[PDB]
Design a protein around this ligand. Structure first.
Ligand SMILES: Nc1nc2c(ncn2[C@@H]2O[C@H](COP(=O)(O)OP(=O)(O)OP(=O)(O)O)[C@@H](O)[C@H]2O)c(=O)[nH]1
Ligand SMILES: [Mg+2]
Ligand SMILES: [Zn+2]
Lengths: 120, 731, 99, 248, 422, 125, 149, 54, 50
RNA sequence: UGCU
């Protein structure tokens, strides 16, 4: 592998890794994010999509990887650091989750409370 | 972490890309903050070094900075943004252990007697040993491979490091540099550097009959060719220059910047460089006669780079790499991404510096490409065999050789190690002579501004070298004065100069760490102000009577004054190797004679920490003391008051440790009596049963049964249950 | 080996344990031999460390006096239990079939 | 024995000078049989071992003596008619050292591998005066070669073997009689044996290659055996001669 | 060593302050001078001083080779061009000495003219080193290059009209990066062009033998009286030292100077926190005689107490409210109470029992030992004795202070009896 | 040629002969004075700021000490580097913007150096 | 060099006389003396060094070289060729060694240690070569030593 | 010895003119005819009589 | 050896011929002298000579 | 990295 990959998929993977390192998530989170991004890219509808579509795909893969480990991360900050708008972000998120069917753990309230209290 | 990091941030404060002008990223101020752990969910929490050791994590603090950039031509600023994590050294200024009482140390699960000063990364304790290298920007006259007495100079500035040599293989001086195709005569370089008069060249080289007789061949070889003007000399140099009038411009640039980088030129004014090469040729000529060859093992020309300089260089390199990566990402993103204005915050890598520091401290291999430095074995695992072992390993010194050849020169014990390094403390084995330990009383100097030094030197009558010709350099009473390898000028009656400089340093207007030495064989007065030099305190002696008296000692004992007050009152002063080379020192008061300038504080301080445990060492042999230190570095005993909570891969403890009966002042100082590593037993020197033929000993069954020699071996067995990429975990 | 320092340390430790003190073995100084000899002769022991000793096996006194005294012995990490090794057939290496 | 030896020093063999490599380095050089060794020693016997005068004479005959070492002054005089180098030989020092070197011998030594100076250039005026008048060779050389002449003239051999560097008179003070011998720190045994007054039948050398090329393979074997035995005995340790014989 | 004789005066002249230059020849000994060499002209510049002297040398002298002169003239110049010739005739007649600048600022250098009983100092506006320059060789090289070009062009007898019309090779004035622009600015060619941009000035030469020399030599003097008190140059040695060396910008971290630089109150506080035992006379001697005794007393009464004539630092000064015992971790209030009890026991009796103090204060052995060592010493068969003797002089000198301290100690005793139930 | 000293130089210049001599002395960077109404600061005070008239005295004590009393402080004058090459003192006065005059005042033979007596400056206070 | 040799000879004479005096004054039944006589361990040289006086510390068969400019240690005058300033040890191990004497003894010890360290590897390489070269010969039955060929 | 031209300061070589030998420079027409005898002695260190060893 | 922590190796042959050859040729009683000069190495040592 |  790593040879039957397009420059667009490589840019998407590099953006995933860059956002992961910016958020300072562990290498396990990085690996899960790249794995989910590849799994989503397997589909053709997301393969031949918009640039904003694939950017929101990077964002939603990061969000799913963050949720799978019970880690709190606000979609607002995700969109802020992803160069996207909330409307298209949510639209593409719903589209990709309906196309994949992966487990989406609910955002725990106490974890988000602690994360936001650490900000003050 | 307080000054050097800020200076590096100021040097690399602004970074911009060539494409899309009017865009820039300006750094304002960088902070390191307190040590924190990134365990919690995007929350920081104070973490202790013991907790880091237990959890196998790194004890680092989040590096933050405030920056200002332009996204869409609208200036946007950030007051606090993390960019990396710097491993915090224990007992540092920002460490949580500093400014703590033993009760708080116990609450935090840390030993109060722990020396500290080591980094904790991934749970392992690493110590950055002190590197010992040769002093930079210094002429070294020595024999070549075949045996040709020549000279060398390694000019190292903040940017480049270039070693240029000069040989007399064929009776004439050929200069060799890494940027030239073939070594060229020195007279051609003289003619190229502005000075074209052979008379002036000879006057600069020297006016002695033997000097002229030895330099004649060079003048003849120069006259054989048609090189008589600066233009022709520069054309020849350009023709001889390797690929990286255009040739003339490149030759002039290499002569001004590349060759002898430490010698500055105001505006293509090679007067100082000409005088420097003339003094070098004069030294080479003087050495070509009497075999006064300088030795490399003389520690007066050695420099010790502590962990601070290494970390500063590493941080500078990593910051330059990060700036280059950011500029590349900008050049790639801004011009073709979208109307959405791009900013750096979205690509500011916060793990780059963290991983870089972690790897550099763990693996120990440092590869700085900007300086072409490939070092190994910089960091070593702190040996926790015993408190003495740790305290002795913390004060080790590795050499630049690193077991390259069995030279025996640097491995031999040089008289220059008096009062600086322990003569007897040395690992027994292949590393004998290359790994050394500092003395009980010594200090390592730092870098100064060098402003007031130059000001005082200029005010004391030091004549400008550009005002007079080089003929004055050949006089017997005219002594040269050098400042960190750079020719500061000339002077007459250097006794007055040295006396006034020392008096001013004692008064305090000059930093007490600035060393001044005088060599009469060459008639050179060196003023050293660079860091890494070894210094030792000495009591000033004036007119056969030391300045320190019983009244001063009583005041110190009662608490009226301190060592800083002694330093300020011109009572005790720091002396360097080069300074004590000229100054006279006395061991005791009865040894003080009319020709004495200083007095030894204490003789037993000559030994190091490991050697301080030897009771009555001056009554034993040297190999005995060496083996004693080597075995004390492995002695079994208690480590600290937190040895029960400490969990290491291998630990050895003693059941009933007892403090020695014959304890030394060094033991009392290091507080080893509180953490002893042995027991006192009623030994009887005799032969019994012939089971003690060769160094063996006979133990008592009842003594061993009553608890004598009982030891405990603690081992650690670690297991990890990590989650893989898929939603599955080890159970 | 010319380890007169060991004998000096032993004598100093004997004097110290007898007089309830801690002698100093400071390099180029410390307690001299005369002080410890005076301490021994005051406490009633020989001024040279050597004392009258009787053989435990035969029960008869020895012709020469034995040099007794407290010495600070320290045990090293080198253990015979850890350094003992015995290799049976055991495993081998994949590249070259050798232990 | 290599490990038993401690590589001591101060073992000048009783001369308090002429530092010779002995021990493991010497054994290494011997077993390697290098053509050029470090500090070669040639011991030669004398026909008149009791006459210090004859000993000095043969010493001066075998030892290389440069022109500048015997001449008291060499001056490049430019008279209004011509320029030439005048060398003044110190006949006093010559007769003190007992060297059979005169103006004719110096003239014959000159003009030998020195930029092809013709015999007519050198001339003799007095008893101890040598006048050298060079000529332009036209090969990138002009009349201003008197400097090169001053540089390379004092290092011209006038008497002795070029390979020999330093010959000394060693004395054996046996109660029966005090005899003299020659110790040469050179690498030419053939010339030392061919020189007059040297008993070539009892001349030994340390360079195995020279001994082989001069006296044959059996002589080389004997010299190797003797040298190994001497080097081993210097350290107080002994080895059966059969081992060194088999090695040789 | 007194000034027996040679009491010479020093005067200052400003007439030739901006017109005085120092020319020195590093290659010409002082024996031979240029007084007999006829000069022609000198090129100079006001800014970036670099003087170039143009002199003339004789030819009929026996120390000149006419054939070599003709050769060098024909090499440097053409056959009969003579439009821009370095020499008027066909021989090397003019010599060129170029000036090199030693230093930028020459204010510290001054020329001293010595007369009978006075020495006149005149500032120097510039110091330049004159050396024989070699530019005729560069001009000859350029001549040879153009001659080789002419030969290559005339290689044929008749050169046809070459159609070498200069195509429009107008290169782009590309925007130069900052690094490349700095490199160009720092290049030697740019500096040489900047120096050449300034126009030259031609000056005539007036040798020392001319009357104008002796006429203008008098300007180095100044009209003034023998004895005149200078208005300036009246600063003290301390001020001169401060001028010639301007500044750059445990609890014993502060040195003696850093302590003295602090107010008297902070000085006394630090001294007490450091020593904890010191007589009033010793405190006065350490602080200095220039400070008032009443001020020192007012400063010490707030941070120390009187114990047997001596002064002992208060307990709260050593143990702040946020501090704790470094050995047991008990709060600072308990340590202060224990230290106050120890001081009260010492004031009541000179001999204090460690066991009794421990049993009363319920404190640990290490804390009791620290409290006792801070202000006393061990005496065999007697317990602990105060380190300093009984100082009755201060008690007799200051009775009111003694009464104040006695009532304060009575209050402290009442508090201790209330707390520990003595 | 034995190395002379400043006291003997002045003695043989004044008593043994009466001909004037041109000397070159190197003064410290900052003189012990203040620029008189020069618009300031503790800046450097050179001869360009001082006026004409008597500015100091030159004393010669016993044992060969040569001092310069330039006010409240006293510097010491020593012999500088003995220059043997030609040194011609000249005044280049540009009276006109187009033509000037170069006047050779004399020759320079000896060099002096004045240094502050730091020992005295320190032991004073 | 003549002065050096004379000083070394004088120091050796002093050492030998001190050792002889110690051996003559020591009484029988002494354990060091008995061991040196029987040859089990030690010798008269070591006995005299640890009782009477230590010998001249010789580095590479010569006195202590001048590490600093024209002197070994700053505690001695420049161009001083005295025995105590060049390496002589007047005191014995029993009376205690001065700082300079102890430093010179440590220098000699480290010199010997590095010499032995180099010797180990040098002789190892030499033995390897010699064995690989001579491992082919063997004694035949006809009393003729022959190679493998 | 080593002589230099007072005009420029370059090294002087000994050549033969049309009347007598003379010192001349390779960069200027300056010359200097030889009038009387000129010598430059060096006094090389002689070989001392190496005495017997032993 | 000096009995100061030296680690020595002990091997057990796995063949009768090798055992016999080791016992005969490498016998301690048969190798009491070195082939270098024939001097005996296996003799008295410290604590036995005295 | 220690050990012999
Ligand atoms: N405990 C231990 N540490 C080692 C060992 N070898 C290397 N080290 C570490 O590595 C450094 C020196 O080892 P080197 O000899 O440079 O490693 P090396 O050169 O590769 O050695 P080789 O592997 O034999 O080539 C030491 O200073 C140690 O830091 C070892 O064998 N044991
Ligand atoms: Mg052993
Ligand atoms: Zn010339």
């Amino acid at each position: 592998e790593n040879e039957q990959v397009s420059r667009s998929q490589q840019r998407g993977l590099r953006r995933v890794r860059d956002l992961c390192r910016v958020l300072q998530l562990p290498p396990t989170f990085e690996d899960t994010a790249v794995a989910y991004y590849q799994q989503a890219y397997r589909h053709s509808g997301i393969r031949a999509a918009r640039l904003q579509k694939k950017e929101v795909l990077v964002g939603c893969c990061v969000l799913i990887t963050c949720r799978q480990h019970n880690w709190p991360l606000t979609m607002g900050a995700i969109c802020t650091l992803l160069y996207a708008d909330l409307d298209v972000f949510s639209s593409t998120y719903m589209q990709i989750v309906k196309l994949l069917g992966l487990d989406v753990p609910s955002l725990c309230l106490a974890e988000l409370v602690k994360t936001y209290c650490s900000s003050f | 972490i307080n000054v050097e990091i800020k200076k590096i941030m100021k040097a690399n404060e602004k970074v911009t890309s060539d494409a899309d002008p009017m865009w820039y990223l300006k750094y304002l101020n960088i902070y390191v903050g307190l040590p924190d752990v990134e365990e919690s969910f995007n929350v920081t929490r104070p973490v202790s070094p013991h907790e880091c050791r237990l959890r196998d994590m790194t004890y680092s603090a989040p590096i933050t900075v405030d920056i200002e950039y332009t996204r869409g031509s609208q200036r946007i600023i950030r007051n606090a943004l993390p960019i990396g994590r710097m491993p915090i050294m224990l007992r540092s200024s920002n460490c949580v252990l500093t400014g703590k009482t033993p009760a708080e140390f116990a609450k935090l699960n840390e030993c109060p007697l722990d020396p500290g000063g080591y980094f904790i990364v991934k749970g392992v304790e690493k110590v950055i040993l002190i590197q010992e290298q040769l002093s930079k920007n210094r002429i070294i006259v020595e024999a070549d491979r075949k045996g040709a007495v020549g000279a060398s100079v390694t000019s190292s500035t903040h940017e480049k490091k270039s070693r240029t040599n000069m040989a007399v293989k064929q009776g004439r001086f050929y200069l060799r540099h890494n940027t030239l195709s073939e070594d060229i005569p020195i007279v051609i370089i003289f003619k190229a550097m502005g000075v074209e008069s052979d008379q002036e060249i000879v006057q600069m080289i020297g006016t002695e009959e033997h000097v002229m007789a030895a330099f004649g061949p060079s003048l003849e070889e120069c006259q054989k060719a048609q090189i008589f003007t600066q233009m022709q000399a520069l054309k020849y140099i350009g023709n001889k220059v390797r690929r990286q009038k255009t040739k003339i411009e490149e030759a002039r640039e290499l002569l001004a910047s590349t060759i002898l980088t430490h010698v500055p030129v105001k505006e293509f004014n090679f007067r100082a460089k000409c005088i420097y090469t003339a003094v070098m040729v004069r030294r080479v000529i003087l050495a070509q006669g009497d075999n006064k060859v300088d030795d490399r093992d003389y520690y007066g020309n050695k420099r010790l780079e502590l962990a601070g300089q290494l970390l500063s260089l590493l941080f500078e390199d990593l910051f330059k790499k990060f700036n280059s990566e950011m500029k590349k990402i900008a050049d790639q993103v801004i011009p073709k991404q979208r109307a959405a204005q791009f900013d750096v915050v979205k690509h500011m890598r916060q793990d780059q510096i963290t991983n870089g520091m972690v790897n550099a401290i763990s693996t120990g291999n440092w590869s700085l490409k900007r300086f072409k430095m490939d070092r190994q074995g910089v960091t070593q695992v702190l040996s926790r065999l015993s408190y003495i072992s740790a305290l002795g390993m913390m004060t080790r010194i590795s050499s630049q050789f690193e077991k390259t050849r069995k030279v025996s020169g640097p491995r031999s014990l040089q008289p220059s190690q008096w009062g600086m390094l322990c003569p007897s403390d040395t690992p027994e084995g292949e590393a004998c002579g290359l790994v050394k330990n500092l003395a009980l009383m010594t200090h390592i100097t730092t870098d100064m501004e060098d402003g007031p030094i130059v000001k005082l030197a200029s005010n004391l009558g030091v004549e400008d070298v550009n005002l007079l010709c080089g003929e004055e350099l050949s006089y017997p009473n005219v002594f040269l004065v050098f400042l960190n390898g750079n020719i500061l000028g000339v002077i007459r009656d250097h006794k007055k100069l040295v006396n006034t400089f020392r008096l001013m340093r004692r008064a305090g207007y000059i930093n007490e760490f600035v060393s001044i030495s005088t060599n009469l064989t060459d008639r050179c007065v060196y003023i050293s102000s660079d860091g890494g030099r070894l210094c030792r305190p000495y009591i000033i002696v004036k007119k056969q009577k030391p300045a320190v008296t019983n009244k001063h000692m009583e005041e110190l004992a009662q608490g009226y004054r301190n060592f800083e007050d002694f330093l300020h009152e011109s009572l005790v002063e720091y002396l360097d190797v080069n300074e004590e080379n000229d100054c006279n020192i006395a061991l005791y008061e009865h040894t003080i004679n009319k020709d004495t300038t200083h007095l030894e504080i204490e003789p037993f301080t000559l030994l190091g920490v490991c050697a301080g445990l030897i009771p009555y060492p001056h009554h034993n042999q040297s190999p005995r003391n060496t083996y004693q230190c080597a075995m004390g570095k492995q002695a079994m005993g208690t480590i600290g008051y937190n040895q029960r909570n400490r969990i290491d891969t291998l630990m050895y403890l003693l059941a009933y440790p007892q403090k020695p009966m014959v304890k030394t002042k060094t033991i009392e100082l290091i507080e080893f009596e509180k953490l002893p590593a042995g027991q006192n037993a009623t030994v009887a020197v005799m032969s019994y049963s012939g089971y003690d033929i060769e160094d063996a000993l006979v133990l008592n069954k009842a003594s061993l049964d009553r608890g004598f020699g009982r030891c405990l071996v603690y081992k650690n067995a670690k297991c990890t249950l990590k989650r893989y990429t898929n939603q599955t975990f080890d159970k | 080996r010319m380890t007169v320092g060991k004998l000096i340390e032993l004598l100093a430790g004997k004097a110290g344990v007898l007089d309830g003190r801690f002698h100093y073995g400071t390099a180029f100084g410390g307690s001299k031999v005369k002080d410890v000899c005076e301490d021994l002769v005051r406490h009633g022991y020989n001024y040279l460390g050597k004392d009258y000793v009787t053989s435990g096996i035969t029960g008869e006194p020895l012709e020469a006096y034995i040099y007794f005294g407290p010495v600070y012995y320290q045990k090293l990490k080198h253990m015979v239990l850890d350094k003992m090794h015995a290799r049976a057939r055991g495993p081998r290496a994949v590249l070259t079939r050798q232990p | 024995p290599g490990t038993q030896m401690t590589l001591k020093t101060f073992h000048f063999a009783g001369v308090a000078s002429m530092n010779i490599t002995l021990g493991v380095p010497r054994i290494k050089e011997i077993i390697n049989a290098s053509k050029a060794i470090s500090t070669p020693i040639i011991t030669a016997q004398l026909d008149k071992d009791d006459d210090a005068d004859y000993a000095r004479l043969v010493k001066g005959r075998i030892e290389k003596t440069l022109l500048g070492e015997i001449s008291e002054y060499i001056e490049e005089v430019f008279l209004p008619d011509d320029c030439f180098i005048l060398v003044k030989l110190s006949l006093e020092r010559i007769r003190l050292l007992r060297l059979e070197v005169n103006a004719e011998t110096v003239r014959y030594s000159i003009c030998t591998s020195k930029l092809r100076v013709k015999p007519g250039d050198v001339a003799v005026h007095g008893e101890a005066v040598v006048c050298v008048t060079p000529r332009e060779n036209s090969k990138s050389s002009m009349y201003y070669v008197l400097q090169f002449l001053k540089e390379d003239l004092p290092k011209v051999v006038v008497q002795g073997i070029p390979e020999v560097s330093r010959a000394v008179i060693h004395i054996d003070e046996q109660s029966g009689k005090e005899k003299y011998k020659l110790l040469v720190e050179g690498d030419n045994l053939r010339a030392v044996m061919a020189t007059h007054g040297v008993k070539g039948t009892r001349t030994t050398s340390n360079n195995t290659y020279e001994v082989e090329k001069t006296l044959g393979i059996e002589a080389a074997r004997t010299t190797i055996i003797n040298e190994i035995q001497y080097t081993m005995v210097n350290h107080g340790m002994s080895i059966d001669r059969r081992h060194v014989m088999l090695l040789s | 060593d007194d000034p027996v004789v040679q009491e010479i005066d020093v005067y200052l002249a400003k007439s030739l302050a901006e017109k005085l230059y120092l020319f020195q020849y590093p290659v010409r000994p002082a024996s031979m001078t240029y007084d007999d060499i006829p000069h022609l002209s000198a090129k100079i510049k006001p800014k970036q001083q670099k003087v170039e002297l143009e002199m003339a040398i004789d030819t009929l002298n026996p120390n000149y080779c006419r054939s070599k002169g003709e050769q060098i003239a024909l090499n440097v110049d053409g056959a009969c061009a003579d439009e821009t010739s370095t020499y008027s005739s066909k021989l090397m007649d003019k010599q060129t000495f170029c000036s090199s600048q030693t230093t930028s600022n020459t204010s510290r250098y001054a020329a001293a003219l010595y007369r009978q009983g006075e020495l006149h100092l005149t500032p120097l506006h510039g110091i330049l080193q004159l050396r024989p320059s070699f530019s005729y060789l560069d001009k000859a090289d350029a001549k040879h290059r153009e001659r080789e070009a002419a030969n290559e062009a005339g290689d044929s007898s008749q050169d046809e009209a070459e159609d070498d019309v200069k195509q429009i090779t107008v290169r782009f004035s590309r925007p130069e990066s900052e690094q490349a622009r700095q490199r160009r600015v720092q290049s030697y060619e740019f500096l040489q062009k900047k120096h050449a941009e300034e126009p030259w000035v031609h000056l005539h030469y007036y040798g020392l033998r001319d009357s104008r020399s002796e006429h203008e030599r008098q300007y180095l003097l100044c009209p003034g009286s023998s004895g005149v008190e200078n208005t300036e140059l009246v600063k003290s040695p301390s001020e001169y030292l401060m001028m010639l060396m301007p500044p750059s910008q445990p609890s014993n971290v502060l040195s003696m100077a850093q302590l003295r630089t602090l107010p008297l109150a902070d000085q006394i506080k630090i001294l007490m926190k450091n020593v904890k035992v010191m007589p009033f006379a010793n405190l006065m001697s350490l602080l200095g005689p220039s400070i008032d005794s009443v001020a020192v007393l007012r400063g010490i009464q707030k941070v120390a107490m009187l114990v047997q004539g001596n002064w002992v630092v208060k307990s709260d000064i050593l143990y702040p409210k946020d501090s704790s015992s470094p050995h047991s971790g008990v709060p600072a209030e308990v340590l202060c109470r224990g230290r106050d009890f120890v001081m009260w026991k010492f004031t009541q009796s000179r001999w204090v029992v460690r066991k009794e103090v421990a049993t009363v204060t319920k404190l640990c052995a290490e804390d009791v030992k620290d409290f006792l060592e801070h202000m006393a010493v061990v005496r065999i068969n007697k317990g602990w004795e105060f380190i300093l003797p009984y100082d009755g002089e201060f008690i007799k000198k200051h009775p009111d202070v003694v009464q104040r301290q006695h009532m304060l100690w009575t209050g402290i005793q009442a508090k201790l009896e209330k707390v520990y139930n003595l | 040629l034995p190395k002379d000293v400043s006291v003997a130089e002045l003695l043989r210049e004044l008593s043994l002969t009466k001909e004037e001599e041109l000397l070159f002395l190197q003064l410290p960077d900052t003189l012990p004075g203040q620029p008189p109404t020069q618009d300031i600061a503790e800046n450097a005070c050179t001869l360009a700021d001082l006026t004409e008239g008597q500015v100091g005295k030159l004393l010669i004590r016993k044992s060969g000490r040569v001092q310069l009393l330039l006010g409240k402080v006293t510097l010491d004058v020593t012999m500088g580097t003995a220059c043997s090459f030609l040194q011609e003192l000249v005044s280049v006065g540009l009276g006109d913007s187009r033509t000037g005059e170069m006047t050779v005042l004399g020759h320079v033979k000896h060099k002096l150096v004045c240094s502050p007596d730091f020992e005295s400056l320190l032991d004073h206070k | 060099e003549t002065l050096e040799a004379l000083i070394l000879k004088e120091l050796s004479v002093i050492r030998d006389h001190a050792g002889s005096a110690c051996l003559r004054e020591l009484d029988k039944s002494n354990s060091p003396l008995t061991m040196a006589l029987c040859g089990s361990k030690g010798s008269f040289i070591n006995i005299s060094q640890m009782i009477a006086c230590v010998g001249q510390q010789a580095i590479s068969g010569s006195r202590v070289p001048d590490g600093f400019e024209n002197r070994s240690l700053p505690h001695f005058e420049k161009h001083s060729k005295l025995p105590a300033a060049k390496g002589f040890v007047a005191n014995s191990f029993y009376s205690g060694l001065t700082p300079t004497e102890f430093f010179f003894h440590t220098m000699a010890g480290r010199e010997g240690l590095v010499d032995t360290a180099v010797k180990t590897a040098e002789t190892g390489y030499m033995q390897r070569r010699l064995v690989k070269s001579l491992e082919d010969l063997c004694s035949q039955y006809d009393l003729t030593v022959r190679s493998s060929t | 010895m080593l002589l230099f031209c007072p005009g420029c300061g370059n090294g002087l070589i000994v050549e033969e003119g049309q009347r007598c030998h003379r010192f001349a420079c390779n960069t200027c027409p300056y010359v200097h005819n030889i009038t009387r005898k000129v010598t430059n002695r060096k006094y090389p260190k002689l070989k001392e009589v190496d005495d017997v060893l032993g | 050896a000096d009995f100061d922590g030296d680690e020595m190796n002990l091997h057990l042959p796995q063949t009768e011929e090798a055992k016999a050859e080791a016992l005969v040729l490498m016998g301690t009683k048969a190798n009491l002298v070195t082939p270098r000069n024939g001097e005996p190495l296996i003799a008295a040592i410290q604590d036995f000579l005295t």
